[PDB]
Amino acid sequence: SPGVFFDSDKGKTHSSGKVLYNARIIPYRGSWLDFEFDPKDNLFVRIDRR
Amino acid sequence: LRVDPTNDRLSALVEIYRMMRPGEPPTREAAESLFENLFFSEDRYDLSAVGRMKFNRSLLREEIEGSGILSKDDIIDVMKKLIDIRNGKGEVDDIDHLG
Amino acid sequence: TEEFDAIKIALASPDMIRSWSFGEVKKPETINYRTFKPERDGLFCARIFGPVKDYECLCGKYKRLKHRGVICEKCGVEVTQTKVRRERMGHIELASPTAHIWFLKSLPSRIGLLLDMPLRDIERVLYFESYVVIEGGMTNLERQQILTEEQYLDALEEFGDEFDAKMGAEAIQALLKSMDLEQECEQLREELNETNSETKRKKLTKRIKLLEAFVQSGNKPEWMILTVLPVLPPDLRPLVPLDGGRFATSDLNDLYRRVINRNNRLKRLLDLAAPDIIVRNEKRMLQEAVDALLDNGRRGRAITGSNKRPLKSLADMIKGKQGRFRQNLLGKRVDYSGRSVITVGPYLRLHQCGLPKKMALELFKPFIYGKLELRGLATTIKAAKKMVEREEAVVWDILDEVIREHPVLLNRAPTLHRLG
Amino acid sequence: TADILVPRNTLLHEQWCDLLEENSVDAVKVRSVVSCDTDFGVCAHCYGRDLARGHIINKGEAIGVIAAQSIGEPGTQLTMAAAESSIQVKNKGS
Amino acid sequence: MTKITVNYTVDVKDIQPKHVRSESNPQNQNKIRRAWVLSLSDNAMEVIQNKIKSAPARHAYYEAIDREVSNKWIELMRKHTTESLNAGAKFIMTSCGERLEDDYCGNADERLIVAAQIVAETIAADFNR
Amino acid sequence: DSAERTAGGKDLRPALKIVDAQGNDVLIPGTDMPAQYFLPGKAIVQLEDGVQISSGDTLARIPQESGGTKDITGGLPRVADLFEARRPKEPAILAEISGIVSFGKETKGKRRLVITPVDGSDPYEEMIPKWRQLNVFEGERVERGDVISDGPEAPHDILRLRGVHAVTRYIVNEVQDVYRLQGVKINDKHIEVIVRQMLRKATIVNAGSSDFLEGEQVEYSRVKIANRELEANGKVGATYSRDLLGITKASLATESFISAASFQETTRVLTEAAVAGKRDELRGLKENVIVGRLIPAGTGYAYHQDRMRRRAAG
Amino acid sequence: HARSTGSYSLVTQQPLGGKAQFGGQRFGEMEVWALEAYGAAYTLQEMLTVKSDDVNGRTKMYKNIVDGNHQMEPGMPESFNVLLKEIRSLGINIELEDE
């Protein structure tokens, strides 16, 4: 469903523990939004996959 | 913010316009237009009623519905809830839950 | 020769390349992919590549009956057995030497490593950008160095009787013609006796290793620069045009046509003693066309829609998926085979399998025909066809005879072990 | 005793295997394809004969492909007081 | 052709390690030519230009000089190996094959320049008729 | 903990030196316990400075799980990564050579450990990641194969140190145990031939007729050394150590270029074959499939053998 | 579905398509491998060379069978000759040296 998507980032760890977090805004139509973490607790934004 | 190399609107818009659209020497007017297109177009950026409802529930808003487009309040709320999850007191959405 | 192992791959010498082929294509003509008539002369020639259609005359306009397996020239055709068709291949004798792109774009640039300068110099000279001193001026000038146009001139007015510097593949041809590999090997190995430096010894050992490799290969470096270009028979390359608005990739054909066009233009220019700039440019796009012919993946690969396959080139025609097309996938479906659901027969002995009568009848039609014409029950293949299709009781004895002990091979759809 | 039980590099089929069972032995050194010094091939006696046959293997028969299909055949069947506390010997022996 | 040709034969300026070349990867070749050129003056240059007609014939004569000096250099280097062995030398089995002991090893460049000077004297004598 | 820490606490590794009842240092050769127990991570120190104890008393306590260690995953992926010889949760280093051992520059990157042979090259240190469970002291005498970092050992170091047959047994036992877990029984000669395929490549240590280090067919090493003792003039040589390439890596390492032509990048491989003039024996079977001729196996091998027997016999 | 002759395709000469007489069976690389593990050599040669691709060989071999004798001669493999000419056009000579 369109809306917020709170998931666990387990492939971004890149051979490390502490699985990260991600929040994806999925519109009914338009551009996706992504707020992901890093293994250093830094919050990054990806508009679509860029 | 320490990682963020911007502190003002025009530089951020320049960077975002360049990274959405590689090359293409940036124009602040073009960057503003692209940002408005990406998050404030009423004709090609829709959340629909279902998206708004799920969105508010994910943010656990007292609201039931609202705009079909994204707002600053929406982004700040989603960042707040993501930070809450990072703090270990939020919830992670089940990928397959039929809700 | 007999079916042997231990096969030898080496760089071909121009003389024996000429020995392979028989004659040279005069003018290139290729199908338009909306007109499928093989136009001659060109990529479709029944004198150099063998008869495209056997036992008949083919020139693209001529279909006369006369040369149905006899050697004689009527419009320029040669008709022989299909064995000669397989061995008949073409060559074109280039006026100018041309390099092979694979040894240039490869990370171990064979010309670059052999000549001991970075591949940038070789790509510059081959792409007709910067001159190279081909054993030219040495008293003040340098024996093997790249030159820009103004530097090349400056050297020329400095010296023109002790100085030579060419462009393109002829420069590398002159360079590689100069070295005596044995002298280099002897000097390097005997220097290694005197040298006491670790890095210097490593460098000498590497150079002598490369030189000894070329010596043992029996390949003269002048060979690896293409002097005469051999060309396939038309039927030996992928070509399957589709009717309508949809077609199939056939870049190899028009790459051949383009290369022949460039070479013919260069031949015409040289026959007329055209000036240096024009002939050099002609050699330039001739080399470019030859390199695109050799590969387009060395020229930059890209993905085309509706087919997860790059644009056809001779190098990409070397290998498709999963490899050599006719020895693995895809897809090697084979005749004289059948497929059917299985039932249990608990009366068959361990060396027996119960096979349906129709399946046997259609698996052994040639053997049945042979037996039927052997007993005199049929006088021709048509009579045998009628005899088997009429399902007469006689064919049952024939099939029992051809199946008396003729075994069959059953394989499971996935074969995960030998017994499969 | 140091008496010779089996001759030089003899094939250890069922009879010799039983003879080694009765004369219980901890270990045997055996010819291996790993120990094999054959080049562009493998010694038969360095290999053994365990196949759909019961006689010493011969020249040919690319045992590499046989090995690969033998390792891949059961691949489908592959599915996804004591140590560190106290060693308790469960039998009477030296 | 000249009965006297001034040349750089057996100078003290031809004794130096050949470190001048025409491209990257500094190593043998495109230094041999520099070696036997340094042992000859420009006089020999115009003498060989006038003696030999056509550019490529002069070039082939240049590589004739180069192969001759290479033969003499090889000659000198295995004479050096031979005299080291006779004077007492034990082959050192190094990461790159066989060499001689450092106290007995000379230099490939020195044998090269000595051979170049010898052949330069020979070619000057050839000019002298 | 053993893991990386500050730059002022990772230059000195904690140690509990145990002296005799005379106040003098003592060392016991031939034992991986000289006296100074160099303390690994989470090593609770029980004895203070100057505390008198008996022989048989605990020095340090390191909590353990009483079982439950995860060094094996099992299943077909386990089979595959053993066949690819992948590092199991980073390799557990062994005694890289026999001799006395000591510490170098601790935690410069990771830790360094010098192993000093009494007849070899004394500077022989290796790298020690702090993620490994350390069991290593100074002044202790070790030998090749002795565990230095505790944990799952990779086949690569096992081959490099304990010998060919050791890693042969290791791989055979691992794969056979995995297949026994499903109850399937496979004769180990198949695993032996697959391993003999795996380590068909070797790296020369002491240069011979080839370069100082390079991947070479070990059978070529045998023939070359046999030739070397055939004549008096040694070339060089030659000393080598087998190395385990991965299954895919060993496949692409095939001497015959026909294999690579169909299954790897081609133009570079074909050019290497052309310039080197590689006279491939065409020993390969699927390669004889690719060319279109009879395979050298079974009846086809017998046929080609008959042809060879008829060669120079007609 | 079973056949001995019938439909023939282009580019890759092998029975394909149609339902009036459906094509042969995909003699996949697994089957080649199963033949390989056995001493089975020749059957690989027929299932790859003489009854799969080479049209002249298939025709002559069908003629031989109809003549009343199960006949095949190795000679010069046609796919080998094709690949040989193909490599030769690359200015690369393939020597036929016998071991």
Add this chain to the structure above:
Amino acid sequence: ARVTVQDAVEKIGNRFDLVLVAARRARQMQVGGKDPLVPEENDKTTVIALREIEEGLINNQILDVRERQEQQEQEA
């Protein structure tokens, strides 16, 4: 009729060159050049060659001397 190859395995221990030699024997009585040396049971030439080699009648030495024979007659 005999379709099992044990006797041929015992006679020729390789049992693989066995296939080649029996195949040649079958090849040249299937087409003229030699005639069956065992009574035919409507059998294919494969199994009559197999029964020949089972009896010890056909072995490598015998077959090779026989073949070299048919040559020195066919040149003569």
Add this chain to the structure above:
RNA sequence: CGGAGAGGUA
């Protein structure tokens, strides 16, 4: 008919 995309079966 050459190769990709899709449903179904085993």
Add this chain to the structure above:
DNA sequence: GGGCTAATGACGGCGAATACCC
């Protein structure tokens, strides 16, 4: 007409290309 014509709701590897603690 037509004859020429030179990415997120896959998954994993992998070399190149960066990222970072002591």
Add this chain to the structure above:
DNA sequence: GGGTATTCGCCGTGTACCTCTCCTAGCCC
């Protein structure tokens, strides 16, 4: 110091078939 530890684009695809579509494209005469 230097090895992880990320980022930065490409690419491969059990077995066999049943059906379907979709395939170098630009373009000046």
